Amino acid sequence: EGVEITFNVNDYDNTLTVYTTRPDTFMGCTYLAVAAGHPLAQKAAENNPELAAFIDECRNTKVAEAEMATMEKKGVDTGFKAVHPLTGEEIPVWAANFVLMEYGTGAVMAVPGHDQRDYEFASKYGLNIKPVILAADGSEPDLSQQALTEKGVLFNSGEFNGLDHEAAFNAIADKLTAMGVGERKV
Numbered sequence: 261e262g263v264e265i266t267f268n269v270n271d272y273d274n275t276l277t278v279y280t281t282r283p284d285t286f287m288g289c290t291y292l293a294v295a296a297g298h299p300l301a302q303k304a305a306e307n308n309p310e311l312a313a314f315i316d317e318c319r320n321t322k323v324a325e326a327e328m329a330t331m332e333k334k335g336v337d338t339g340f341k342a343v344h345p346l347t348g349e350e351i352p353v354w355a356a357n358f359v360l361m362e363y364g365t366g367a368v369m370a371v372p373g374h375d376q377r378d379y380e381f382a383s384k385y386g387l388n389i390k391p392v393i394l395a396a397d398g399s400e401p402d403l404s405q406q407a408l409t410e411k412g413v414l415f416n417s418g419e420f421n422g423l424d425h426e427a428a429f430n431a432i433a434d435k436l437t438a439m440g441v442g443e444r445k446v
């Protein structure tokens with residue numbers, strides 16, 4: 261059980277769609293990551309040689325999911341901005357070597373405040389790291405050095421503040437659904 265979530269992207273005729281099993285952190289989404297082989301990444305490749313090079317470098321490295329906690333994570337800013345549906349604010353779309361086309365939409369929403377892979381990528385590239393879950397003693401999480409990986413009560417999540425994990429999961433899934441922008445999967 262998770263959700264597909266659809267973002268519009270400024271100056272791009274298609275949409276971006278992401279799967280996650282953690283809609284509860286969705287207010288903490290500070291950027292999107294697409295596979296090198298993804299249509300948006302290659303529409304952008306057209307006016308970007310750094311990305312052309314990166315895409316070719318990736319086409320060589322057969323990155324396997326199980327080998328990923330090991331590999332140097334790498335990526336490039338596509339230039340495209342996506343609009344966060346709940347928030348209204350623009351977030352960068354990056355191409356990343358750790359996102360694949362084979363399984364999934366070839367795109368992922370990232371919450372570096374609460375997923376460690378996400379935290380390492382954002383640390384390395386200067387992307388925003390947003391706390392939305394509280395530590396288990398109900399303090400603000402320490403995000404000076406690593407991601408707070410625990411499930412917990414949301415904060416700094418607007419209308420969703422105060423909700424525990426299961427309540428957040430449903431309240432944010434239901435909202436994205438009522439906005440016709442999200443879909444539960446079984």
Ligand code: MET
Nearest residue numbers: 280282285369371374375
């Ligand atoms: C911060 S936990 C959720 C983030 C992760 N990228 C996911 O889509 O599940």
